[PDB]
Design a protein around this ligand. Structure first.
Ligand SMILES: Cc1c(Nc2ncc(Cl)c(-c3cnc4ccccn34)n2)cnn1C1CCNCC1
Length: 302
């Protein structure tokens, strides 16, 4: 008469001794609990000590802490320079900890927003070169995911993060969705402004629609994270986009970058470039070391 439905967490080789962990600065607050910065011993090869991000959950329910552990654990499948790494778990005792790679400059949306001139002398908007470097890291990260049979479905600037050295990576899954909440629309909460026409039509997502979204992220970069289709309602976006409407070339946006956007925003998904193809087109523009750290240039990219 039935199959039993009891969710559980299973300690594995990602388990890390609590005593090896310390927490300092508060980074913010996630859905299950507060997240801190801190320091973890013995979690990176040949690194006695590593600065990390610690996502925590004693007042929470066991159902919740279980849900949090399993979800967070999704990130375990990934080992790529351009994807935020999970370094450990402390499931034993409380509070529950998940130890992540620290991205000191936060999420890309926030970072981009911080580049906006205050209302003093200011840094000029990011160069073509800088923007392109970002585009390529993001694309490398997505290529990796695709190679790993994954479809992201929520690729946006908010869902990328930024390291100390300014490297952009595919962010820890699901961290800005409730923060940048107006970037979503319950029509399931969907990132309508980032979505392909086909996805707006039948609610299916592919790698090809991830590419669409990639285009939108580039647009974000070039606008310092304006709201796409800023003048339009959520409902009006559905129609515009489904009807072949496109985002405008941002002021001062270098031609080349807008061209990139354009390849991504082709109506027919089958005509969009792949992430690999995207990287191939700009690889010469990439910082030297890309060849050493990228999925693209690795033996895994076969
Ligand atoms: C340092 C930092 C991260 N770095 C980071 N690195 C790894 C992870 Cl895994 C996380 C993370 C995951 N979930 C949350 C929820 C809130 C804040 C940070 N995180 N954050 C994210 N935001 N920030 C700050 C940016 C300046 N404004 C205050 C926050």
């Amino acid at each position: 008469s039935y199959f039993s439905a009891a969710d559980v967490y299973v300690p594995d080789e990602w388990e890390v001794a609590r005593e090896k962990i310390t927490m300092s600065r508060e980074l913010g607050q996630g859905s299950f609990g507060m997240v801190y910065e801190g320091v973890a011993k013995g979690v990176v090869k040949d690194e006695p000590e590593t600065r990390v991000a610690i996502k925590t959950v004693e007042a929470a329910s066991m159902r919740e802490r279980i849900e949090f552990l399993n979800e967070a654990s999704v990130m375990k499948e990934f080992n790529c320079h351009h994807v935020v790494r999970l370094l450990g778990v402390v499931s034993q005792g409380q509070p529950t900890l998940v130890i992540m790679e620290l991205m000191t400059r936060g999420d890309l949306k926030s970072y981009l927003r911080s580049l906006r001139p205050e209302m003093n002398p200011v840094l000029a908007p990011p160069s073509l070169s800088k923007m392109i470097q970002m585009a390529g890291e993001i694309a490398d990260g997505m290529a990796y995911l695709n190679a790993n049979k994954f479809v992201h479905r929520d690729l946006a600037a908010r869902n990328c993060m930024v390291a100390e050295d300014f490297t952009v990576k595919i962010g820890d899954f699901g961290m800005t969705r409730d923060i940048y909440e107006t970037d979503y629309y319950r029509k399931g909460l969907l990132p309508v402004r980032w979505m392909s026409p086909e996805s707006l039509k039948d609610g299916v997502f592919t790698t090809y629609s991830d590419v669409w979204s990639f285009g939108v992220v580039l647009w974000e970069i070039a606008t310092l994270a304006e709201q796409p289709y800023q003048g339009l309602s959520n409902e009006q976006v559905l129609r515009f986009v489904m009807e072949g409407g496109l985002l405008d070339k941002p002021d001062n946006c270098p031609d080349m970058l807008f061209e990139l956007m354009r390849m991504c925003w082709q109506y027919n998904p089958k005509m969009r470039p792949s992430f690999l193809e995207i990287i191939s087109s700009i690889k010469e523009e990439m910082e030297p070391g890309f060849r050493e750290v990228s999925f693209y240039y690795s033996e895994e990219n076969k």
